[PDB]
Design a protein around this nucleic acid. Structure first.
Lengths: 121, 111, 216
RNA sequence: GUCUGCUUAAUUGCGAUAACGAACGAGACCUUAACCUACUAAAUAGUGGUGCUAGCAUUUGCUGGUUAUCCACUUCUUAGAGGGACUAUCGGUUUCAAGCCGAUGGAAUUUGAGGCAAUAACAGGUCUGUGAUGCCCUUAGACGUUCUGGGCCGCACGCGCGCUACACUGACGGAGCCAGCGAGUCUAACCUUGGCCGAGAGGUCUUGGUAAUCUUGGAAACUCCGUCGUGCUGGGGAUAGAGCAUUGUAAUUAUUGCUCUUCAACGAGGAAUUCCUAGUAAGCGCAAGUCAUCAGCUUGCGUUGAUUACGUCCCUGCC
RNA sequence: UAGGGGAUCGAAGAUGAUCAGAUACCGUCGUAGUCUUAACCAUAAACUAUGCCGACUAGGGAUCGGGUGGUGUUUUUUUAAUGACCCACUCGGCACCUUACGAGAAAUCAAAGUCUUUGGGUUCUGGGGGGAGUAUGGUCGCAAGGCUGAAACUUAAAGGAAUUGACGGAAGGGCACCACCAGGAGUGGAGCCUGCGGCUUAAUUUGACUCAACACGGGGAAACUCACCAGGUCCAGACAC
RNA sequence: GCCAGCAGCCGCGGUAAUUCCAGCUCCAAUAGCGUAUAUUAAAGUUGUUGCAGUUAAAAAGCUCGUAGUUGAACUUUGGG
């Protein structure tokens, strides 16, 4: 086999960076396009670049595939980034839990603890 | 023979050449033979591409001693050429698309 | 063309740095080599030993031609490196550079009788590699350069002019010998005599003093 | 640099990398087999229409013959230009890298196949291809040249490469009755029909052909229709006796053939051990290479044409 | 060496196996010895194949033995107490990792470092390879044997580390039905083809012998071809003297 | 034509020997050259200056010791 090659991958993997947008999976619409872009030798070589690409946009959609991002996947990570609201505020169990041996340094260090704690295994 | 066997290489390389390796078989000041190899640039040994790119030669030397062979292999700049091909079969070259600006709203003219 | 690389390169092309004594003060690295081309031009080369090996293939014996190269001027500046390569014409060559990143001060000075214009070292130094032991010792005036052909060589380029020596120390090893001797002069500076103790007080690093030029 | 890994027909490629980028090999390229109802032309290819025409029907039909009766054609058949396929299109399968399955369209396992085939060589072979050739020997009682006769074809036997056959899934016979690679005479006898003579093997008159123009559109496995009936036969075709032919100055250690009879083993092949993944394994032929002939070999083709995988490192072998 | 002990192993000895031989490897038995008392011998790859004293260089993280400190971890019993524990520190080990500023022929070495810049203290040893740790004397021992230790003669290398051109009947990976599966048609059997062994002969011309010799020099030769003979000839012996 | 012979050692010589025998030709010393012996430097391959002892040839099997050999520091500096 059927086992892909560099020249090919590393020609689709360079391409896939810029042209994700023209970008497709009917691969017979890339084939044409993949000439206007690359400056390829051959007809055979060219039909094995786009074959690979279509093996990217058929799995991209399905999810986050690897070591390749194209200004479109990277802005859905500043949009997916963020989250939990409210931040940490205990009322419900108010007093925040503070080992009960957690009183000595901070009696020897501050101002206000609204604390939770283990009277003695 | 060592010295010329850099005007060969360097005289060739100066002349916008892609690559040149140079076999020197025969006998030397030895009695048991050798060969000697040299070189510059990258060089192919397989297909068409030899047929088309590089080229040979063998120029029989009728020393005293005993007889030699010389073998040169130039390589040609795919660009400097016109002969058919302008690259290898390998070389896949890419544009750095265009720098576009987004939307506005609608907008139209009257001609 | 030169061209450059790293924060350190760019600076010296421009010439925001001047002398080699900036660079051993803050004690920088050095990767590019032109970095001491622009600076020290005085510099001259010398080839000590061109020997064949060997890594012995299935119907043959491979060879290279270790060279080993020493560089410098007169004034307290030695250079040293060892790039095998195949054929001489990489092998010396990108020896000559190998040495140049390894330029290293020295710290010519007095025997006794202070007088006027350094001829000998400051102090006793020693060096060690595998077997060889070198005991450089400061000798009075033009006494001489007391040693093997090669050591003399090193030590000329590095003036320095006069100094007793001694070995141990298999010094049919031209290569492990120089390795060593070198690692001693480069170590005059790595020896507190009273005349330093007066505490000097730290300048400021080039790496954020000309921070902006240093980048695009 | 030339590598842990995954990758392939492949140092074939992604990727890992104080290693960066190139040369040769491989692949690219050349041969041929496929495809083009688009082009370009064909009394050395064939169509209808056209008569002239020879039969059956009579129904206008059906079956012809015609290197010109004319023309018109160019699917066909040739063959130049040309084009055209890239594993393509989704779907999976993976580092969603190089790659690998599958189904659709398609004429179409590297499209099939050869051929060119680095690096270093081996004291493999060859002076018995040489007027290529070192140095020894031969130089007229030559080992040089040439007319004869036999000799390399001599057998108790040892070792390889091969032909037919142990059957009724065949041997004999009528009657159907089908290609492709060639070749070929000139300064002289290469192919030969046709029409006779011969049971036949052939003989010949005479014919064409320097050839898509002639012999040349008729090859065998087979469908036909059966006799043979489980009889070493009506499988087997050994070895023999003569004649008759067809070449060859010489037919003897019968070159081949025919005409009819002698009717040898072997009744599916031990210790071994090969070659083979598709029109492929193998069998039925034939044209060439010898050549005056004598093929049970070398090459090349097609006409029928399947099993069995489409994977491993158990082995050998080599990396 | 003389008493005691004498399970097991087990030279020696015997054996059966394997094998061309096998006095060895493999198997089963087996004195002696292994064990101990008392007395000998003093050698070893007695091995870090690295003399000891010292003093100084550069990082670590373990561990054994101590000791010091932390309202340190559990023990819970009431708090302690110790003790185990944790960590901090140290001195002394027994090593190890990592660098190389040094050293080296290198492989490697915190010592083989501080050595041509040659010197802290001192005891042994070697000066090419063999002859040979023999012959000799001298000596310790009962003996085995030790320590001491020649020369004549002979000889241009013997050796150390390391290198891939290569090599292995060592490991780890690939690739091919000239390698196996899955199988088909077979070769080897014979009736016969030829071709290479060989005996024969007037002569039975001649290359070729594991894959790379065997219907192969396009070798299908009645003359010829033609190299074997058994024989007939004629020279197709230039050039100069 | 692996026989003569040369060659201090590496080595030539087994049909075209840069080594032998000899011709020409050249090179070195030169009224003086070679040759053998002994010694020197070369020899840091006897060594105090200056060696080697991880495996090259060498750290004793390990410890105690009478000689031998080395042996912490401190006893007036400074100033006039």
């Amino acid at each position: 086999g059927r086992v892909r090659t560099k020249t090919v991958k590393r020609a689709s993997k360079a391409l896939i960076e810029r042209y994700y947008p023209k970008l497709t999976l009917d691969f017979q619409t890339n084939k044409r396009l993949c000439d206007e872009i690359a400056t390829i030798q051959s007809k055979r070589l060219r039909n094995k670049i786009a074959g690979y690409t279509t093996h990217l946009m058929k799995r991209i959609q399905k999810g986050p595939v690897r070591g390749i991002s194209f200004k479109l996947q990277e802005e859905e990570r500043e949009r997916k980034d963020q989250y939990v609201p409210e931040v940490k505020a205990a009322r419900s169990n108010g007093v925040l839990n503070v080992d009960n041996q957690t009183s000595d340094l901070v009696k020897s260090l501050g101002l206000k603890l609204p604390l939770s704690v283990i009277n003695v295994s | 023979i060592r010295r010329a066997a850099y005007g060969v290489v360097r005289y060739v390389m100066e002349s916008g050449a892609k690559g040149c390796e140079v076999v020197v078989s025969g006998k030397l000041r030895a009695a048991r033979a050798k060969a000697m190899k040299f070189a510059d640039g990258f060089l192919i040994h397989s297909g068409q591409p030899v047929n088309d790119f590089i080229d040979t030669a063998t120029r029989h030397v009728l020393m005293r001693q005993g007889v030699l062979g010389i073998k040169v292999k130039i390589m040609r700049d795919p660009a400097k050429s016109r002969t058919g091909p302008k690259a290898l079969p390998d070389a896949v070259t890419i544009i750095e698309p265009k720098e576009e600006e987004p939307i506005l709203a609608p907008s139209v003219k009257d001609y | 063309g030169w061209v450059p690389v790293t924060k350190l390169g760019r600076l010296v092309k421009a010439g925001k740095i001047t002398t080699i004594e900036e660079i051993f003060l803050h004690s920088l690295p050095v990767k590019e080599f032109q970095i001491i081309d622009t600076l020290l031009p005085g510099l001259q080369d010398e080839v000590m030993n061109i020997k064949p090996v060997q890594k012995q293939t299935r119907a043959g014996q491979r060879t290279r031609f270790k060279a080993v190269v020493v560089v410098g001027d007169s004034n307290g500046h030695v250079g040293l490196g060892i790039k095998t390569a195949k054929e001489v014409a990489g092998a010396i060559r990108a020896g000559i550079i190998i040495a140049k990143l390894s330029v290293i001060p020295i710290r010519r000075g007095y025997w006794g009788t202070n007088l006027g214009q350094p001829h000998s070292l400051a102090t006793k130094t020693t060096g060690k590699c595998g077997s060889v032991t070198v005991r450089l010792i400061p000798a009075p005036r033009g006494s001489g350069i007391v040693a093997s052909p090669a050591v003399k060589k090193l030590l000329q380029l590095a003036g320095v002019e006069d100094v007793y020596t001694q070995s141990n120390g298999k010094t049919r090893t031209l290569e492990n010998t120089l390795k060593a001797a070198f690692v001693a002069i480069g170590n005059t500076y790595g020896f507190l005599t009273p005349n330093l103790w007066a505490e000097q007080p730290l300048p400021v690093s080039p790496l954020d003093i000309y921070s902006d030029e240093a980048s695009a």
